[PDB]
């Protein structure tokens, strides 16, 4: 199995209310393990996973600092983008960024990324070659040159291919017992009456981890993917996920319908139907 390290960083100006709010959240494959929020009492990078307690007082200082550094940096960014878009100094705006790296099971690099956005829409992003940039609008077209001229691209690549893939392994080792685990999805179906002799059948899948799972409803061997309904997989508050998919079927004719659960911890896809 491949793995990745993703950073979600967000900056939000809030005029009249003080300095922007900066936050950083990091994940190693679906489990939050570190974070920083400028609005805590004492803004300090801190752990979100036990395995991260395995780190010396040093690590936590270098991060807390390079964090406070980025804070200033996006803080300047926000004002910069205001000139780029001829926007009012009075409005509140957002900068989102996601940077990180994926790897293969050999521990080698698979993919590296970093992309900015601004007030919810695409801004700039590092192409897959890790050498060129793709700018969304002409404002981002400027930042593109600043970085071309400052070799920011190769500066980043050094980071992705180096520091990023390396700590990924470190992490993956500190808490492999938590990150390389597989919790199997326990399932069941619920039944709900409806108008016009119709019936809604829901298929629940719980306590599973990796978040990646598939649910389908089948009738005589064909998946009714189109006349179905589901919810983006979700965290259940203890480090595992869950999902549900439902389908409307005619009353009295529901045992002709089955649910199919596809997950890493399921050697054999789960198959269930209703239990009157």
């Amino acid at each position: 199995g491949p793995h990745s390290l993703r950073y979600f960083v967000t900056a939000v100006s809030r005029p009249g209310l003080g300095e922007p709010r900066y936050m950083e959240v990091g994940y190693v494959d679906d489990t939050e393990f570190v974070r920083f929020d400028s609005d805590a009492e004492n803004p300090r990078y801190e752990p979100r996973a036990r395995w991260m307690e395995q780190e010396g007082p040093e690590y936590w200082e270098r991060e807390t600092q390079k964090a406070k550094g980025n804070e200033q940096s996006f803080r300047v960014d926000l004002r910069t983008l205001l000139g780029y878009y001829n926007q009012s100094k009075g409005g509140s705006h957002t900068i989102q960024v996601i940077s990180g790296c994926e790897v293969g099971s050999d521990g080698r690099l698979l993919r590296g990324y970093q992309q900015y956005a601004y007030d919810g829409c695409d801004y700039i992003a590092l192409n897959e070659d890790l050498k060129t940039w793709t700018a969304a609008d002409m404002a981002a077209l400027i930042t593109k040159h600043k970085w071309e001229q400052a070799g920011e691209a190769e500066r980043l690549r050094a980071y992705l291919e180096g520091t990023c893939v390396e700590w990924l392994r470190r992490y993956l080792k500190n808490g492999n017992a938590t990150l390389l685990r597989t919790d199997s999805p326990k399932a069941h179906v619920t039944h709900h009456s409806r108008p016009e002799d119709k019936v809604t059948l829901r298929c629940w899948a719980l306590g599973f981890y990796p978040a990646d799972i598939t649910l389908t409803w089948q009738l005589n061997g064909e998946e009714l993917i189109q006349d179905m309904e589901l919810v983006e997989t979700r965290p259940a508050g203890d480090g595992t996920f869950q999902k549900w998919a439902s389908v409307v079927v005619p009353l009295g004719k529901e045992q002709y319908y089955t649910c199919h659960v596809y997950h890493q911890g399921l050697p054999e896809p789960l198959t269930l139907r209703w239990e009157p």
Binding site: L206, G207, R234
Partner: protein, 99 residues
């Protein structure tokens, strides 16, 4: 751009009276990121509530989870009340043990 949240509420385990569980209020697909979320028990707000698992989508919309430990009862009613700039009124979503 603006996107209204999607307040989903749910527990970790299928609810059984007198058995500890976790209550979850996943708030997703919202922009701007400024949002306020409370968990209510019998109309009252619950103090011990954790916020976590923030993230964005390829779409750039925010997702954040709020959970809390708890023990269902038959009478007790749990809810998630969300406040965000895209609704002129606080939207509350209730817990459906039977969903």
């Amino acid at each position: 751009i603006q996107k209204t949240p999607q307040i989903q509420v749910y527990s970790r385990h299928p609810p059984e009276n007198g058995k500890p569980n976790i209550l979850n209020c996943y708030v997703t697909q919202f922009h701007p990121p400024h949002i306020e979320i409370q968990m209510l028990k019998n109309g009252k707000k619950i103090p011990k509530v954790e916020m976590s698992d923030m993230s964005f989508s390829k779409d750039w919309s925010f997702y954040i989870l709020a959970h809390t430990e708890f023990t269902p009862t038959e009478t007790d009613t749990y809810a998630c009340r969300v406040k965000h700039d895209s609704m002129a009124e606080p939207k509350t979503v209730y817990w459906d043990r039977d969903m």
